[PDB]
Each structure stands twice: as structure tokens, then as C-alpha cells.
């Protein structure tokens, strides 16, 4: 957990405190319950996960669209070769086996 405040993670800590509790170690379990500081740090981490899930899916879909458009015209032919729409050879035998 970065020092979002000046030299501390939260305003309930002192400056330049590198202990596990200051920088986001949650000592409790879910059964026992998180403290307010631990609750906030775990919320930051879950928010990071939600942002990642929301934002990476667009890059992934773009990548898969580009791959499909690049490889869409490639078919195994009756002579065993793997050719594109221009008839150009990509592999003389599919998968080399």
C-alpha cells in the first residue's frame, strides 16, 4: 500500500512506519473481522481487481478480433496444405504432423 498521504498510508499512522500493519497486512481472518484500516486496504485491493476486470476485456476483445481477421481465410485443403485466400502456402502440412 503506497504512501498516499505524506509519508504514510492512512492518517492514523505515524510518518515513515514500514511495519506490516501500516502498509497493508491484514492480520485477521474473515471470521474474526477486519479492522477499519484493514477494511480500507482490502477495499483498495478489491477495487484494483474490479478496475482490471472492467478495463482489460476491451483490449482482449480487440486482440481476438485482430487475430480472427488475420487468420480468417486459412483452411486445410484436400492436398493437406494450409493456404490463405490468395492460395499462398502457410504450411505444407497442417501442424507439421
Amino acid at each position: 500500500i503506497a504512501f498516499g498521504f505524506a509519508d504514510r498510508s492512512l492518517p492514523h499512522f505515524t510518518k515513515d512506519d514500514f511495519s506490516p500493519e501500516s502498509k497493508g497486512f491484514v492480520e485477521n481472518s474473515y471470521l474474526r473481522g477486519l479492522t477499519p484500516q484493514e477494511f480500507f486496504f482490502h477495499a483498495m485491493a478489491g477495487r484494483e481487481g474490479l478496475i482490471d476486470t472492467a478495463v482489460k476485456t476491451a483490449e482482449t476483445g480487440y486482440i481476438q478480433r485482430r487475430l480472427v481477421k488475420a487468420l480468417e481465410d486459412i483452411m486445410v485443403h484436400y492436398d493437406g496444405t494450409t493456404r490463405n485466400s490468395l492460395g499462398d502456402i502457410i504450411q505444407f502440412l497442417y501442424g507439421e504432423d
Binding site: 485466400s85 502456402i89 501442424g95
Partner: protein
């Protein structure tokens, strides 16, 4: 993050001192890396000096412009890089043959110093000082900013034919220069590999480019334990290297083919 994997010759590959010497040989150091603080001194008489330390040095170096440069070289920095005063002064004179006259204190001297002379001249000294500190090379391949002493658990057969692990020192490096590092003595020239397959294409050809491309894609996919069957990535790398050069998966790559207009427009 460009990086090489420099396999060493077997005799070196087991010994650690030899591997460290090769490491020192491959890494790039500039005069910045061993310099503490540079001055500019007015020294009106070449045969004399206004300074009180280096008078003996130049009286022992004897038996142009009055502008002097007195740059200092820290001790431990030389010690850790196996660098002395002699090699540094030789390298400076190698590229500053006759437009510069160099005085240098000795290595055992209580202060490690270098003095230079020019042959209003208060700004050519500044330009020369900047250009020396920022362009004088000492040893190694330009483009290799860091070198690491890494350990690889290769599995090779024994003299009984049974496969046994074997613990060898190899090299990893920041930055990329495949052709020049491949030439450096002590390196297994037949096994150096780069993570930039454009470099592979420029140096080793297109088939090696295909191999490197498959290796990178397999690494990225199988990083987390996912397994994609071989033939799919083989097809993907065969499409990218079929024309003889690297074809990117973009409009700039896909739309330079000879296919019909309707395919290209549909994308």
C-alpha cells in the same frame, strides 16, 4: 524490457571467476560511472602549475592553451570494476589523439586525478568536458547497461546415458546487442538468444525469427500453467513469417496483402 541470455563456453560455464571476468568484459562503463566531480582550472604555464599537488607529477612527466581540466576519479569505483588509471588514460588518448594533452596522477596517489590541456577558450573546455564524460567508453559492448550472473539448471545425459541435472553459470543482460555480444570471446557464439525477435531477424534470419516468436508466445501463454496445443501457435507464427519479413497483426500488416478489397474494407 530487452534482454539477452548469453550461454558461456563450458570451461567458463563451470568456473565462477572466469564467468565474472566475462561479465566484466561484456558490461558497458563510461567515464560517468567512475567520476566524482569535475573542475576547470586556469593553468597559465604548461611547464609549471598554479597547483601544489601535481607539480611533481608533471616534472616527472617532462624530464598550448592555459586552460586546464582537473577531473577526479573515486577509488572504490575503480576497484569494483577492475579499472585502473592507465586504461582510462589510454582510452582517452585513443579518441583524443592530438586535440588534447593529458596529465594524469598515478594510481597509488593519495588523490586520483586527471589533467587535460587545450591546444577566449572558456567554453571549448566545457564542451570537451561534457563530451568526455558522456561519450568516452572504456570496455564492453555499447547497449548492454547491466549484466547478471544467473544460474541455469540444464538437464544433460551422463556418461551412462541417464539424464542428470547440471548447475551452470550463464548471463542475462539489460539492453540488447546480439551481433557484438555474440562475437565477444568466452561466449558460446552458437547459443546466444535475444527476447527481441526483430533483432533475431536482423541478425540470424527468418527461420530463427520463427523459432524465437514461437518461444515468446509459448512463454507468455504457458506462464500461468495454461496449455495451448502446439499447432495453433505454430500456425500463428507461420502466418507472421511467411513473406520473409515480420508481418504484424494490425491494419498496417493485414491490409498490405494482395487479397480482395472487400476483405480489407470489412476489417
Amino acid at each position: 524490457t530487452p534482454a539477452l541470455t548469453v550461454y558461456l563456453d563450458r570451461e567458463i560455464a563451470l568456473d565462477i571467476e572466469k564467468a565474472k571476468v566475462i561479465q566484466s568484459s561484456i558490461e558497458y562503463t563510461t567515464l560517468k560511472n567512475v567520476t566524482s566531480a569535475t573542475e576547470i582550472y586556469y593553468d597559465p604555464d604548461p611547464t609549471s602549475t598554479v597547483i601544489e599537488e601535481d607539480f611533481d607529477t608533471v616534472e616527472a612527466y617532462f624530464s598550448q592553451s592555459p586552460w586546464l581540466l582537473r577531473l577526479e576519479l573515486d577509488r572504490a569505483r575503480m576497484l569494483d570494476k577492475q579499472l585502473t588509471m592507465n586504461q582510462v588514460a589510454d582510452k582517452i588518448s585513443e579518441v583524443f589523439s592530438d586535440d588534447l594533452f593529458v596529465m594524469w596522477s598515478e594510481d597509488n596517489a593519495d588523490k586520483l586525478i586527471i589533467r587535460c590541456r587545450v591546444i577566449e577558450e572558456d567554453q571549448m573546455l566545457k564542451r570537451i568536458e561534457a563530451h568526455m564524460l558522456d561519450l568516452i567508453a572504456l570496455r564492453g559492448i555499447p547497449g548492454i547497461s547491466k549484466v547478471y550472473m544467473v544460474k541455469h539448471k540444464v538437464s544433460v545425459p551422463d556418461e551412462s546415458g541417464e539424464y542428470k541435472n547440471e548447475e551452470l553459470w550463464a548471463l542475462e543482460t539489460d539492453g540488447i546487442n546480439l551481433a557484438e555480444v555474440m562475437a565477444v570471446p568466452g561466449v558460446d557464439s552458437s547459443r546466444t538468444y535475444s527476447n527481441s525477435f526483430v533483432e533475431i531477424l536482423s541478425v540470424l534470419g527468418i527461420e530463427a525469427t520463427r523459432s524465437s516468436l514461437y518461444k515468446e508466445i509459448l512463454n507468455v501463454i504457458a506462464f500461468d500453467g495454461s496449455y495451448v496445443n502446439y499447432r495453433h501457435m505454430a500456425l500463428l507464427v507461420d502466418v507472421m513469417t511467411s513473406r520473409g519479413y515480420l508481418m504484424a497483426i494490425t491494419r498496417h500488416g493485414i491490409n498490405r496483402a494482395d487479397t480482395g478489397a472487400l476483405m480489407r474494407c470489412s476489417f
